[PDB]
C-alpha cells in the first residue's frame, strides 16, 4: 500500500507551503482566493451556503474530493482532502494511524472532533498543520490543512 504511504509523505511535504498537492497545487492558505479555487476547479458540487462553510468538490474517478473554506477577506482558511471513492485503498482508505507513524514518525497532537466520533491526528508543518481525521475504522475520512 505504498500509494497511501507516498500520499501521506506528499501531503506532509506540501503542507509546509500551506498547499495541498496534485489538483490543489498552487492554492495557498491565507493567500489564494475563492476566485482562484473556482478558476482551478470550476463551480462546486455543493457551494458555501447554510450550515456548509466549504466549497465542496466531489471525487471523480481517480480525481479526489476537496473542500475549501475562506476567511472574511475571501482567502483560503482551510483545505479539506477527501480522497477518492473508486480504488480508495490507494489513498485515504489505506491511510491508517500506523502508516502515519511509519511515514511521519510520532504525532504532535491527538484532538477530538466536534459533533462527530472521529479522531484527529495532528502533524505540525511549519506555519501550518495537517489534521488527519480518522473514522471509527482505522482509515482516514479527510485530511485538513490550516494555519497554526
Tab-separated table of C-alpha atoms in Angstrom, residues 3-29 40-41 62-68 79-83 91-92 125 130 132 143-145:
chain	number	residue	atom	x	y	z
A	3	UNK	CA	0.483	4.511	-2.811
A	4	UNK	CA	-1.076	5.563	0.559
A	5	UNK	CA	2.436	5.961	2.084
A	6	UNK	CA	3.704	8.214	-0.776
A	7	UNK	CA	0.418	10.168	-0.395
A	8	UNK	CA	0.988	10.808	3.366
A	9	UNK	CA	4.619	11.790	2.503
A	10	UNK	CA	3.498	14.153	-0.342
A	11	UNK	CA	0.764	15.721	1.903
A	12	UNK	CA	3.255	16.310	4.785
A	13	UNK	CA	5.744	17.877	2.281
A	14	UNK	CA	3.380	20.401	0.595
A	15	UNK	CA	1.680	21.255	3.949
A	16	UNK	CA	4.853	23.346	4.793
A	17	UNK	CA	3.918	25.648	1.767
A	18	UNK	CA	0.297	25.932	3.027
A	19	UNK	CA	-0.905	23.967	-0.011
A	20	UNK	CA	-2.110	20.512	-0.864
A	21	UNK	CA	-0.678	18.520	-3.831
A	22	UNK	CA	-1.893	17.459	-7.315
A	23	UNK	CA	-5.138	19.255	-8.420
A	24	UNK	CA	-4.998	21.700	-5.452
A	25	UNK	CA	-1.415	22.741	-6.360
A	26	UNK	CA	-0.684	26.489	-6.024
A	27	UNK	CA	-3.786	27.247	-3.928
A	28	UNK	CA	-2.224	28.732	-0.755
A	29	UNK	CA	-3.877	29.166	2.677
A	40	UNK	CA	-8.988	25.917	-10.880
A	41	UNK	CA	-11.891	23.547	-10.007
A	62	UNK	CA	-9.111	8.892	-9.645
A	63	UNK	CA	-9.524	12.663	-9.010
A	64	UNK	CA	-10.061	13.220	-5.230
A	65	UNK	CA	-12.671	15.304	-3.421
A	66	UNK	CA	-11.810	18.706	-1.916
A	67	UNK	CA	-13.314	21.309	0.334
A	68	UNK	CA	-12.273	24.949	0.648
A	79	UNK	CA	-8.278	22.878	2.662
A	80	UNK	CA	-10.013	19.518	3.128
A	81	UNK	CA	-8.785	16.441	1.132
A	82	UNK	CA	-11.458	13.674	0.914
A	83	UNK	CA	-9.592	11.042	-1.129
A	91	UNK	CA	-5.343	6.800	-0.963
A	92	UNK	CA	-7.209	7.648	2.360
A	125	UNK	CA	4.200	21.614	9.304
A	130	UNK	CA	-2.117	18.730	8.836
A	132	UNK	CA	-5.574	13.553	9.606
A	143	UNK	CA	-7.135	15.407	5.784
A	144	UNK	CA	-7.339	19.120	6.742
A	145	UNK	CA	-4.756	21.849	6.152
